[PDB]
Amino acid sequence: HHHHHVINLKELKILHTSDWHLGVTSWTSSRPVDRREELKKALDKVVEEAEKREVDLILLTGDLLHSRNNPSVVALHDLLDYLKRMMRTAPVVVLPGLKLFGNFVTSISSDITFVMSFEPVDVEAKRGQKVRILPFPYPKNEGDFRFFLESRLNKLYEEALKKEDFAIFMGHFTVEGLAREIIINRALIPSVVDYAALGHIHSFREIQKQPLTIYPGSLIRIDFGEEADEKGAVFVELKRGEPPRYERIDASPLPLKTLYYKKIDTSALKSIRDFCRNFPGYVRVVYEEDSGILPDLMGEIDNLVKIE
């Protein structure tokens, strides 16, 4: 199953997913929970939607592995497993959050490209579309730093002007003013790209519409700051005549809940027990004062991962 070659094809379907954090175990200081099974389920749903929609290109951004430096064999084997699966559907371009194995794999394949530098790369998509990738990976400096970054973005704008069909910006950074980190103003994302695929933020954000610029988010709620979050992937469709459209692919991951109390008194105990009873995800209790020896709530309630 190799690529198609359709004359005058003026469209491109993209799956963009990000920030998988393969290998994460949560709440290791209170109650370790291995998130793999939930994550593999979320990823499977993303793989199946990609197949279902017959996408042309899959973009992966952000931290696909939880461990900055020392991913486990399982985490690595899961990554390569899902990479392979995706490459069966459509070509995969990865902007990382080893340089050796990435460069080698890109050489020997026509369906995975690791963009490991600031240099543009042209890729071929599932139906023969030509796509120019403008990458902005994580890069000592201080305010010359800002001028460095800005110089790099300017170069990518010029290289984007040299596109044949589609141009796609990929970046691993924090958009200034979100509501060491690399902080970059959204106005400096080259305006002449058709899509800007961003990663590193766990939460789905539509940053702007022109160029359409999106963080898809993580696929699980990694910690309690993510309880109100949208988790999933994004499906983007590009057509030469027209504005880009996109649909969120929800990963439907386990819900999180933080229950708050001054003291864990009689009423707070009943509140906690009732709530967790049939709650299908994980619960945190936040309280302020000790008032006696606390009952063994974690032995009693398997969903409760943190009192603290």
Side-chain angles (χ1 to χ4, degrees), residues 2-9 11-47 49-67 69-98 100-129 131-145 147-179 181-238 240-261 264-308:
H2 71 61
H3 298 156
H4 308 303
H5 305 280
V6 181
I7 201 137
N8 305 328
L9 178 51
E11 300 153 41
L12 183 78
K13 287 178 284 178
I14 300 161
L15 186 101
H16 173 199
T17 177
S18 189
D19 291 280
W20 301 343
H21 284 264
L22 279 169
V24 60
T25 293
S26 311
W27 315 302
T28 63
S29 61
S30 59
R31 202 220 267 267
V33 174
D34 184 339
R35 316 300 302 291
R36 176 175 186 228
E37 178 188 330
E38 177 192 7
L39 183 50
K40 279 173 57 51
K41 180 179 184 175
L43 279 163
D44 290 351
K45 174 150 182 194
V46 178
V47 164
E49 279 291 322
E51 280 152 6
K52 204 189 317 186
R53 305 164 179 271
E54 295 194 303
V55 298
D56 298 313
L57 197 66
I58 292 157
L59 311 171
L60 310 179
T61 51
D63 302 291
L64 302 191
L65 294 165
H66 185 66
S67 195
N69 62 354
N70 196 28
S72 69
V73 187
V74 191
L76 279 184
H77 166 279
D78 288 335
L79 181 73
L80 295 178
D81 176 22
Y82 283 94
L83 289 182
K84 229 186 297 159
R85 297 196 197 188
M86 278 166 177
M87 301 171 198
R88 293 195 221 108
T89 299
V92 173
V93 192
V94 180
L95 180 86
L98 196 62
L100 282 190
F101 297 123
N103 292 337
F104 175 78
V105 161
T106 304
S107 301
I108 64 150
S109 189
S110 304
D111 288 283
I112 190 146
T113 308
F114 291 67
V115 188
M116 315 273 68
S117 82
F118 282 87
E119 307 286 7
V121 307
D122 287 284
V123 307
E124 193 185 71
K126 193 41 163 193
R127 291 176 290 166
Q129 303 101 321
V131 185
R132 174 156 266 214
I133 304 291
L134 296 316
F136 204 101
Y138 183 98
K140 273 282 139 270
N141 302 291
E142 69 308 342
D144 298 307
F145 190 49
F147 184 72
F148 164 82
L149 298 182
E150 171 182 309
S151 89
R152 289 286 218 238
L153 293 160
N154 289 343
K155 180 174 169 283
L156 296 174
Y157 178 106
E158 291 302 318
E159 289 155 349
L161 290 173
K162 291 169 211 146
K163 70 175 190 191
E164 310 170 60
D165 290 331
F166 306 85
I168 299 171
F169 175 95
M170 310 176 71
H172 187 84
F173 55 74
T174 300
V175 164
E176 187 175 56
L178 264 188
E181 263 188 333
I182 301 299
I183 290 167
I184 289 218
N185 203 265
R186 48 178 272 249
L188 293 177
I189 291 170
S191 73
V192 300
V193 304
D194 298 296
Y195 183 47
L198 307 184
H200 180 242
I201 292 313
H202 299 173
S203 304
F204 165 81
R205 298 290 163 95
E206 191 200 274
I207 291 306
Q208 53 187 357
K209 299 266 227 158
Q210 249 166 351
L212 177 60
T213 306
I214 293 166
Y215 291 104
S218 61
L219 295 171
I220 70 185
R221 311 187 147 93
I222 290 151
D223 206 347
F224 283 95
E226 295 162 56
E227 1 187 316
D229 254 4
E230 300 200 311
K231 302 314 188 181
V234 99
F235 166 81
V236 184
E237 183 150 27
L238 309 165
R240 293 300 224 116
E242 335 193 34
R245 20 163 318 266
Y246 77 102
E247 301 177 29
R248 285 207 20 87
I249 299 158
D250 198 59
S252 310
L254 293 177
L256 297 186
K257 183 70 180 188
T258 297
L259 292 173
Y260 291 98
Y261 308 94
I264 288 164
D265 60 3
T266 279
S267 169
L269 287 165
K270 169 166 194 43
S271 169
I272 289 157
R273 287 173 177 147
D274 292 347
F275 179 83
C276 297
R277 188 145 51 239
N278 299 115
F279 185 71
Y282 307 103
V283 181
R284 180 172 66 152
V285 179
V286 167
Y287 75 104
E288 295 165 34
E289 312 193 304
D290 294 312
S291 64
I293 301 158
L294 204 72
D296 183 8
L297 289 175
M298 294 196 201
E300 167 180 354
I301 306 179
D302 32 286
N303 245 12
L304 183 58
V305 301
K306 201 167 191 147
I307 323 186
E308 75 223 333

mmCIF file of all heavy atoms in Angstrom, residues 42 64 72 81 119 131 194 199 218-220 229 244 285 294:
data_model
loop_
_atom_site.group_PDB
_atom_site.id
_atom_site.type_symbol
_atom_site.label_atom_id
_atom_site.label_comp_id
_atom_site.label_asym_id
_atom_site.label_seq_id
_atom_site.Cartn_x
_atom_site.Cartn_y
_atom_site.Cartn_z
ATOM 1 N N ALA A 42 -6.794 5.686 24.580
ATOM 2 C CA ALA A 42 -7.023 6.987 23.941
ATOM 3 C C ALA A 42 -6.351 7.050 22.575
ATOM 4 O O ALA A 42 -6.988 7.329 21.553
ATOM 5 C CB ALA A 42 -6.522 8.121 24.882
ATOM 6 N N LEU A 64 5.878 13.182 23.399
ATOM 7 C CA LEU A 64 5.259 11.878 23.159
ATOM 8 C C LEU A 64 5.671 10.883 24.263
ATOM 9 O O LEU A 64 4.924 9.990 24.606
ATOM 10 C CB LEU A 64 5.607 11.367 21.765
ATOM 11 C CG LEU A 64 5.230 12.221 20.543
ATOM 12 C CD1 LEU A 64 5.415 11.400 19.267
ATOM 13 C CD2 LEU A 64 3.848 12.758 20.593
ATOM 14 N N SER A 72 11.369 4.327 29.574
ATOM 15 C CA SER A 72 11.499 2.911 29.852
ATOM 16 C C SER A 72 11.375 2.155 28.539
ATOM 17 O O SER A 72 10.971 2.725 27.571
ATOM 18 C CB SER A 72 10.413 2.473 30.830
ATOM 19 O OG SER A 72 9.120 2.500 30.228
ATOM 20 N N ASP A 81 5.450 1.276 18.443
ATOM 21 C CA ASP A 81 4.227 0.563 18.092
ATOM 22 C C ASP A 81 3.197 1.478 17.457
ATOM 23 O O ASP A 81 2.718 1.204 16.362
ATOM 24 C CB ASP A 81 3.666 -0.125 19.362
ATOM 25 C CG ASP A 81 2.312 -0.844 19.143
ATOM 26 O OD1 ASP A 81 1.976 -1.187 17.985
ATOM 27 O OD2 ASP A 81 1.607 -1.123 20.159
ATOM 28 N N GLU A 119 15.459 23.496 9.964
ATOM 29 C CA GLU A 119 15.454 23.461 8.494
ATOM 30 C C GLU A 119 14.126 22.933 7.932
ATOM 31 O O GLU A 119 13.612 21.922 8.389
ATOM 32 C CB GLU A 119 16.597 22.573 7.948
ATOM 33 C CG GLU A 119 18.017 22.883 8.448
ATOM 34 C CD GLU A 119 18.638 24.149 7.840
ATOM 35 O OE1 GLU A 119 17.937 24.896 7.121
ATOM 36 O OE2 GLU A 119 19.824 24.420 8.140
ATOM 37 N N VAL A 131 3.976 18.773 0.699
ATOM 38 C CA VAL A 131 3.791 19.591 1.868
ATOM 39 C C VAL A 131 5.135 20.085 2.376
ATOM 40 O O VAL A 131 6.030 19.314 2.684
ATOM 41 C CB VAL A 131 3.018 18.830 2.987
ATOM 42 C CG1 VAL A 131 2.730 19.749 4.176
ATOM 43 C CG2 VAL A 131 1.725 18.257 2.447
ATOM 44 N N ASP A 194 -0.486 27.262 5.890
ATOM 45 C CA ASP A 194 -1.880 26.852 5.846
ATOM 46 C C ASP A 194 -2.400 26.342 7.213
ATOM 47 O O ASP A 194 -3.608 26.331 7.482
ATOM 48 C CB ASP A 194 -2.010 25.747 4.813
ATOM 49 C CG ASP A 194 -1.631 26.207 3.399
ATOM 50 O OD1 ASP A 194 -2.308 27.087 2.855
ATOM 51 O OD2 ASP A 194 -0.727 25.604 2.786
ATOM 52 N N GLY A 199 2.676 22.100 19.907
ATOM 53 C CA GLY A 199 2.660 21.154 20.970
ATOM 54 C C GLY A 199 3.442 21.642 22.156
ATOM 55 O O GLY A 199 4.081 22.692 22.091
ATOM 56 N N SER A 218 -2.968 17.011 25.523
ATOM 57 C CA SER A 218 -2.696 15.622 25.910
ATOM 58 C C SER A 218 -3.925 14.744 25.645
ATOM 59 O O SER A 218 -5.008 15.239 25.302
ATOM 60 C CB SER A 218 -2.292 15.534 27.401
ATOM 61 O OG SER A 218 -3.325 16.005 28.277
ATOM 62 N N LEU A 219 -3.764 13.436 25.807
ATOM 63 C CA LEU A 219 -4.869 12.507 25.576
ATOM 64 C C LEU A 219 -5.420 11.954 26.869
ATOM 65 O O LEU A 219 -6.520 11.368 26.894
ATOM 66 C CB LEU A 219 -4.396 11.367 24.685
ATOM 67 C CG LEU A 219 -4.001 11.738 23.260
ATOM 68 C CD1 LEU A 219 -3.370 10.519 22.689
ATOM 69 C CD2 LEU A 219 -5.233 12.195 22.436
ATOM 70 N N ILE A 220 -4.673 12.153 27.954
ATOM 71 C CA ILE A 220 -5.182 11.906 29.281
ATOM 72 C C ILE A 220 -5.015 13.160 30.160
ATOM 73 O O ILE A 220 -4.282 14.084 29.821
ATOM 74 C CB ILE A 220 -4.518 10.676 29.931
ATOM 75 C CG1 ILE A 220 -3.046 10.917 30.278
ATOM 76 C CG2 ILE A 220 -4.634 9.467 29.054
ATOM 77 C CD1 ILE A 220 -2.379 9.684 30.790
ATOM 78 N N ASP A 229 -10.485 20.202 31.286
ATOM 79 C CA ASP A 229 -9.828 20.219 29.981
ATOM 80 C C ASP A 229 -10.546 19.466 28.891
ATOM 81 O O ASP A 229 -11.262 18.533 29.160
ATOM 82 C CB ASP A 229 -8.425 19.577 30.107
ATOM 83 C CG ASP A 229 -7.377 20.569 30.053
ATOM 84 O OD1 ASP A 229 -7.803 21.736 30.001
ATOM 85 O OD2 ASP A 229 -6.173 20.243 29.965
ATOM 86 N N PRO A 244 -9.349 26.817 6.104
ATOM 87 C CA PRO A 244 -9.196 25.529 6.739
ATOM 88 C C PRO A 244 -10.377 25.277 7.643
ATOM 89 O O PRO A 244 -10.921 26.226 8.190
ATOM 90 C CB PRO A 244 -7.942 25.717 7.583
ATOM 91 C CG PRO A 244 -7.984 27.122 7.979
ATOM 92 C CD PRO A 244 -8.501 27.833 6.753
ATOM 93 N N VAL A 285 -8.757 14.842 47.299
ATOM 94 C CA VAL A 285 -9.324 15.615 48.352
ATOM 95 C C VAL A 285 -8.266 16.597 48.852
ATOM 96 O O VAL A 285 -7.092 16.246 49.047
ATOM 97 C CB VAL A 285 -9.846 14.741 49.496
ATOM 98 C CG1 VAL A 285 -10.405 15.612 50.575
ATOM 99 C CG2 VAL A 285 -10.928 13.742 48.980
ATOM 100 N N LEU A 294 -7.215 10.372 60.569
ATOM 101 C CA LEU A 294 -8.075 10.238 59.421
ATOM 102 C C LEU A 294 -8.406 8.776 59.190
ATOM 103 O O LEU A 294 -7.503 7.960 59.195
ATOM 104 C CB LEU A 294 -7.340 10.775 58.188
ATOM 105 C CG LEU A 294 -8.172 11.253 57.012
ATOM 106 C CD1 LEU A 294 -8.856 12.575 57.331
ATOM 107 C CD2 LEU A 294 -7.275 11.386 55.812
#
